[PDB]
């Protein structure tokens, strides 16, 4: 106020200067992703998709180095656009040199100031520009919220996110904003929480915290299923638990994003995976 800093913040930060990107994938819905700026172009690690949000770490050799949560990769720089977000502050704060409790003061910001968000989810801070002064301001000092404040954890936030897509049409290979397949809905929802998961159900099945007992399932957990009787050992489907014994999924049965009764669903579970941590 403005000097008070919580002991819960680290006294040190390795957070690198980043900007915000939105994928535009011109002319299509996807872009190949690589693990270097000089890749074996035949061996892309995966793809990223239209209207996904990323952090931009930099550019090299015609590629953008992008980040979603703990995952980073390289995509053609023409597949995304840089984003800045105008907002205002609601409480006096300092712009600090870094997102920690030992940064130097770049600029005092009075309450009600017009600012521009340049990066988000910076370990409890936004990176902003105020009157040309650039640095890190505590998240709660700004009006804009990059994710929901409501919810006890990111799992509940993920459940709300898939609920916002109820009624969207099923289309194989899509991940929003208007059409989805089962695994694209999962990846999209966690993209909006700055959490990376892979694109296909059979890989989503292999990461995240394993919830061994279904009694311990919570909103935002994903459930993978084996639904192909001609390949009965292969994971082919996925949905998100949203509480009260229901999960939401994009299904060809109805060709729509819809609720489904978990225990009445007539296909075997593979794993229950928790990709949220807070």
Short mmCIF file of C-alpha atoms in Angstrom, two decimals:
data_model
loop_
_atom_site.label_atom_id
_atom_site.label_comp_id
_atom_site.label_asym_id
_atom_site.label_seq_id
_atom_site.Cartn_x
_atom_site.Cartn_y
_atom_site.Cartn_z
CA UNK A 1 0.00 0.00 0.00
CA UNK A 2 2.01 0.50 -2.09
CA UNK A 3 5.03 -0.98 -0.31
CA UNK A 4 3.45 -4.06 1.29
CA UNK A 5 4.61 -7.29 -0.33
CA UNK A 6 3.50 -10.75 0.77
CA UNK A 7 6.07 -13.20 2.12
CA UNK A 8 4.34 -15.79 -0.09
CA UNK A 9 6.10 -14.17 -3.06
CA UNK A 10 9.62 -15.37 -3.78
CA UNK A 11 12.38 -12.86 -3.12
CA UNK A 12 13.87 -13.84 -6.51
CA UNK A 13 12.53 -14.22 -10.04
CA UNK A 14 13.82 -15.87 -13.21
CA UNK A 15 10.76 -14.76 -15.18
CA UNK A 16 11.81 -13.64 -18.65
CA UNK A 17 10.23 -10.71 -20.46
CA UNK A 18 7.35 -12.05 -22.56
CA UNK A 19 4.42 -10.76 -24.59
CA UNK A 20 0.98 -12.18 -25.43
CA UNK A 21 0.14 -14.02 -28.63
CA UNK A 22 -3.11 -15.24 -30.16
CA UNK A 23 -2.94 -17.86 -32.89
CA UNK A 24 -4.36 -16.74 -36.23
CA UNK A 25 -3.12 -19.64 -38.43
CA UNK A 26 -3.89 -17.67 -41.62
CA UNK A 27 -6.07 -19.52 -44.11
CA UNK A 28 -6.60 -22.52 -41.83
CA UNK A 29 -6.94 -23.63 -38.19
CA UNK A 30 -3.55 -25.11 -37.27
CA UNK A 31 0.20 -24.55 -37.42
CA UNK A 32 3.02 -27.05 -37.03
CA UNK A 33 5.01 -26.71 -33.81
CA UNK A 34 8.67 -27.59 -33.28
CA UNK A 35 11.13 -27.88 -30.41
CA UNK A 36 13.74 -25.62 -32.04
CA UNK A 37 14.00 -22.55 -34.25
CA UNK A 38 15.98 -24.64 -36.78
CA UNK A 39 13.98 -27.86 -36.77
CA UNK A 40 13.80 -31.06 -38.70
CA UNK A 41 10.75 -29.71 -40.53
CA UNK A 42 9.51 -33.26 -41.16
CA UNK A 43 9.32 -33.98 -37.40
CA UNK A 44 7.01 -31.44 -35.80
CA UNK A 45 6.34 -32.25 -32.15
CA UNK A 46 2.63 -31.41 -32.57
CA UNK A 47 0.42 -28.52 -33.76
CA UNK A 48 -1.14 -25.47 -32.16
CA UNK A 49 -4.53 -24.14 -33.14
CA UNK A 50 -6.53 -21.07 -34.12
CA UNK A 51 -7.52 -18.73 -31.27
CA UNK A 52 -5.25 -20.36 -28.70
CA UNK A 53 -3.52 -17.92 -26.36
CA UNK A 54 0.23 -18.06 -25.67
CA UNK A 55 3.10 -16.18 -24.14
CA UNK A 56 5.76 -15.11 -26.65
CA UNK A 57 9.33 -15.58 -25.43
CA UNK A 58 10.92 -14.22 -28.60
CA UNK A 59 11.51 -14.70 -32.31
CA UNK A 60 14.29 -16.48 -34.18
CA UNK A 61 14.81 -17.67 -37.76
CA UNK A 62 11.24 -16.88 -38.77
CA UNK A 63 9.72 -18.68 -35.76
CA UNK A 64 7.99 -17.42 -32.65
CA UNK A 65 9.04 -19.09 -29.39
CA UNK A 66 5.74 -19.55 -27.55
CA UNK A 67 4.74 -20.86 -24.14
CA UNK A 68 1.59 -22.32 -22.60
CA UNK A 69 2.11 -22.95 -18.90
CA UNK A 70 5.10 -25.30 -18.58
CA UNK A 71 5.19 -26.14 -22.31
CA UNK A 72 7.22 -24.22 -24.89
CA UNK A 73 7.64 -24.70 -28.63
CA UNK A 74 8.31 -22.84 -31.88
CA UNK A 75 5.74 -21.92 -34.54
CA UNK A 76 5.94 -19.86 -37.72
CA UNK A 77 5.83 -16.19 -36.77
CA UNK A 78 3.08 -15.58 -39.34
CA UNK A 79 0.72 -17.95 -37.48
CA UNK A 80 0.05 -15.61 -34.54
CA UNK A 81 -0.44 -11.95 -33.63
CA UNK A 82 0.84 -9.99 -30.65
CA UNK A 83 -1.84 -8.82 -28.21
CA UNK A 84 -1.92 -5.94 -25.75
CA UNK A 85 -4.87 -5.37 -23.42
CA UNK A 86 -6.02 -1.97 -22.11
CA UNK A 87 -7.37 -1.85 -18.56
CA UNK A 88 -7.22 0.31 -15.43
CA UNK A 89 -5.90 -0.07 -11.91
CA UNK A 90 -8.24 -0.13 -8.92
CA UNK A 91 -5.73 0.34 -6.07
CA UNK A 92 -2.47 2.26 -5.81
CA UNK A 93 0.51 0.01 -6.55
CA UNK A 94 4.13 0.00 -7.65
CA UNK A 95 5.35 -1.17 -11.02
CA UNK A 96 8.30 -3.38 -10.10
CA UNK A 97 11.35 -4.41 -12.11
CA UNK A 98 10.46 -8.11 -11.73
CA UNK A 99 7.60 -10.26 -10.36
CA UNK A 100 9.05 -10.83 -6.89
CA UNK A 101 9.10 -9.18 -3.47
CA UNK A 102 12.55 -7.63 -4.02
CA UNK A 103 12.18 -5.77 -7.32
CA UNK A 104 13.08 -2.12 -7.64
CA UNK A 105 10.33 0.44 -8.19
CA UNK A 106 9.92 1.49 -11.82
CA UNK A 107 6.95 3.80 -11.29
CA UNK A 108 4.26 4.49 -8.74
CA UNK A 109 0.79 3.96 -10.21
CA UNK A 110 -2.11 5.81 -8.57
CA UNK A 111 -5.44 4.04 -8.36
CA UNK A 112 -7.71 4.50 -11.39
CA UNK A 113 -4.80 4.74 -13.88
CA UNK A 114 -5.11 3.67 -17.51
CA UNK A 115 -2.55 0.94 -18.29
CA UNK A 116 -1.80 -1.59 -21.02
CA UNK A 117 -1.29 -5.27 -20.20
CA UNK A 118 1.71 -6.75 -22.03
CA UNK A 119 1.92 -10.14 -20.27
CA UNK A 120 -0.24 -12.09 -17.83
CA UNK A 121 0.02 -14.78 -15.14
CA UNK A 122 3.53 -13.55 -14.24
CA UNK A 123 3.78 -15.35 -10.89
CA UNK A 124 1.10 -13.13 -9.36
CA UNK A 125 1.72 -10.06 -11.53
CA UNK A 126 0.84 -8.57 -14.88
CA UNK A 127 3.50 -6.90 -16.97
CA UNK A 128 2.17 -3.50 -18.03
CA UNK A 129 2.99 -0.19 -19.67
CA UNK A 130 1.87 2.92 -17.76
CA UNK A 131 2.82 6.23 -19.39
CA UNK A 132 5.78 4.47 -21.01
CA UNK A 133 6.96 2.91 -17.72
CA UNK A 134 7.20 -0.86 -18.07
CA UNK A 135 7.18 -3.51 -15.37
CA UNK A 136 5.25 -5.82 -13.08
CA UNK A 137 2.15 -4.91 -11.07
CA UNK A 138 0.33 -7.16 -8.61
CA UNK A 139 -2.56 -9.00 -10.27
CA UNK A 140 -5.28 -7.73 -7.94
CA UNK A 141 -4.35 -4.08 -8.54
CA UNK A 142 -5.86 -4.27 -12.05
CA UNK A 143 -9.48 -4.51 -13.14
CA UNK A 144 -8.94 -7.00 -15.98
CA UNK A 145 -8.84 -10.69 -15.06
CA UNK A 146 -7.26 -13.16 -17.47
CA UNK A 147 -9.15 -16.02 -15.80
CA UNK A 148 -12.13 -16.37 -13.50
CA UNK A 149 -11.79 -15.23 -9.91
CA UNK A 150 -14.68 -17.51 -8.92
CA UNK A 151 -13.93 -21.14 -8.12
CA UNK A 152 -11.95 -22.90 -5.40
CA UNK A 153 -9.32 -24.05 -7.92
CA UNK A 154 -8.45 -24.19 -11.61
CA UNK A 155 -10.37 -27.47 -11.89
CA UNK A 156 -13.64 -25.68 -11.19
CA UNK A 157 -12.56 -22.95 -13.63
CA UNK A 158 -11.95 -25.58 -16.32
CA UNK A 159 -15.41 -27.04 -15.69
CA UNK A 160 -16.98 -23.61 -16.16
CA UNK A 161 -15.00 -23.17 -19.39
CA UNK A 162 -16.33 -26.35 -21.01
CA UNK A 163 -19.83 -25.39 -19.88
CA UNK A 164 -19.51 -22.24 -22.00
CA UNK A 165 -19.27 -24.52 -25.07
CA UNK A 166 -22.39 -26.61 -24.45
CA UNK A 167 -24.26 -26.93 -27.73
CA UNK A 168 -21.20 -26.42 -29.94
CA UNK A 169 -21.15 -28.75 -32.93
CA UNK A 170 -18.84 -31.74 -33.08
CA UNK A 171 -16.29 -31.60 -35.90
CA UNK A 172 -13.31 -33.94 -35.99
CA UNK A 173 -9.99 -32.15 -35.60
CA UNK A 174 -11.34 -28.84 -34.26
CA UNK A 175 -10.57 -26.98 -31.04
CA UNK A 176 -12.74 -23.86 -31.16
CA UNK A 177 -14.12 -21.35 -30.87
CA UNK A 178 -17.31 -22.75 -32.46
CA UNK A 179 -16.69 -26.46 -33.14
CA UNK A 180 -14.82 -29.16 -31.24
CA UNK A 181 -13.89 -32.78 -31.06
CA UNK A 182 -13.59 -34.53 -27.72
CA UNK A 183 -9.88 -33.94 -27.07
CA UNK A 184 -9.81 -30.48 -28.67
CA UNK A 185 -12.39 -29.30 -26.15
CA UNK A 186 -10.09 -30.45 -23.33
CA UNK A 187 -6.99 -28.77 -24.73
CA UNK A 188 -8.86 -25.55 -25.50
CA UNK A 189 -10.31 -25.28 -21.99
CA UNK A 190 -6.94 -25.63 -20.31
CA UNK A 191 -5.38 -23.26 -22.85
CA UNK A 192 -7.68 -20.61 -21.38
CA UNK A 193 -6.10 -21.35 -17.97
CA UNK A 194 -2.52 -21.16 -19.35
CA UNK A 195 -2.09 -24.92 -18.76
CA UNK A 196 -0.75 -27.17 -21.51
CA UNK A 197 -2.06 -30.58 -22.36
CA UNK A 198 -1.50 -32.47 -25.58
CA UNK A 199 -4.06 -32.54 -28.36
CA UNK A 200 -5.24 -36.17 -28.64
CA UNK A 201 -6.99 -38.31 -26.05
CA UNK A 202 -4.42 -41.11 -26.24
CA UNK A 203 -1.70 -38.65 -25.16
CA UNK A 204 -3.85 -36.74 -22.67
CA UNK A 205 -4.20 -40.21 -21.11
CA UNK A 206 -0.46 -40.25 -20.35
CA UNK A 207 0.11 -37.02 -18.39
CA UNK A 208 -1.35 -35.10 -15.49
CA UNK A 209 -1.77 -36.34 -11.95
CA UNK A 210 -3.21 -39.86 -11.92
CA UNK A 211 -6.41 -40.07 -9.85
CA UNK A 212 -6.54 -43.80 -9.16
CA UNK A 213 -9.91 -43.96 -7.36
CA UNK A 214 -12.93 -42.43 -9.08
CA UNK A 215 -14.29 -41.54 -5.64
CA UNK A 216 -11.58 -38.84 -5.55
CA UNK A 217 -12.58 -37.22 -8.86
CA UNK A 218 -13.16 -33.46 -8.86
CA UNK A 219 -14.45 -30.91 -11.39
CA UNK A 220 -11.86 -30.26 -14.06
CA UNK A 221 -10.39 -33.76 -13.98
CA UNK A 222 -10.44 -35.39 -17.40
CA UNK A 223 -11.54 -38.98 -17.99
CA UNK A 224 -10.23 -40.97 -20.95
CA UNK A 225 -12.11 -43.93 -22.42
CA UNK A 226 -11.57 -46.82 -24.83
CA UNK A 227 -14.58 -46.68 -27.18
CA UNK A 228 -13.41 -48.56 -30.32
CA UNK A 229 -14.34 -52.25 -30.21
CA UNK A 230 -12.09 -52.88 -33.23
CA UNK A 231 -9.16 -51.45 -31.21
CA UNK A 232 -10.29 -52.21 -27.65
CA UNK A 233 -6.96 -51.40 -25.98
CA UNK A 234 -6.63 -47.93 -27.54
CA UNK A 235 -7.73 -44.71 -25.86
CA UNK A 236 -10.13 -43.00 -28.25
CA UNK A 237 -12.28 -40.60 -26.21
CA UNK A 238 -12.11 -38.10 -23.36
CA UNK A 239 -14.40 -35.88 -21.32
CA UNK A 240 -14.19 -33.51 -18.37
CA UNK A 241 -15.78 -34.20 -14.99
CA UNK A 242 -17.97 -31.28 -13.90
CA UNK A 243 -19.46 -32.64 -10.68
CA UNK A 244 -22.70 -34.28 -9.59
CA UNK A 245 -21.77 -37.46 -11.44
CA UNK A 246 -21.65 -35.73 -14.84
CA UNK A 247 -18.93 -35.07 -17.37
CA UNK A 248 -19.03 -32.83 -20.44
CA UNK A 249 -17.68 -34.02 -23.79
CA UNK A 250 -17.84 -33.43 -27.51
CA UNK A 251 -19.59 -36.51 -28.89
CA UNK A 252 -20.53 -37.81 -32.31
CA UNK A 253 -23.67 -39.13 -30.58
CA UNK A 254 -25.65 -35.94 -31.08
CA UNK A 255 -22.65 -34.32 -32.81
CA UNK A 256 -22.51 -31.82 -29.96
CA UNK A 257 -20.81 -30.75 -26.74
CA UNK A 258 -23.10 -32.10 -24.03
CA UNK A 259 -23.46 -33.50 -20.52
CA UNK A 260 -23.13 -37.23 -19.92
CA UNK A 261 -23.93 -39.35 -16.87
CA UNK A 262 -20.56 -40.73 -15.78
CA UNK A 263 -21.65 -44.04 -14.30
CA UNK A 264 -24.16 -44.76 -17.09
CA UNK A 265 -21.57 -44.14 -19.83
CA UNK A 266 -21.11 -47.60 -21.40
CA UNK A 267 -17.39 -47.48 -22.19
CA UNK A 268 -14.43 -48.38 -19.96
CA UNK A 269 -12.36 -45.66 -18.32
CA UNK A 270 -8.62 -45.67 -19.05
CA UNK A 271 -7.37 -43.04 -16.60
CA UNK A 272 -8.57 -40.03 -14.64
CA UNK A 273 -6.08 -37.18 -14.96
CA UNK A 274 -5.81 -33.95 -12.97
CA UNK A 275 -3.98 -31.21 -14.89
CA UNK A 276 -4.84 -28.43 -12.44
CA UNK A 277 -2.67 -27.84 -9.37
CA UNK A 278 -4.16 -24.80 -7.63
#
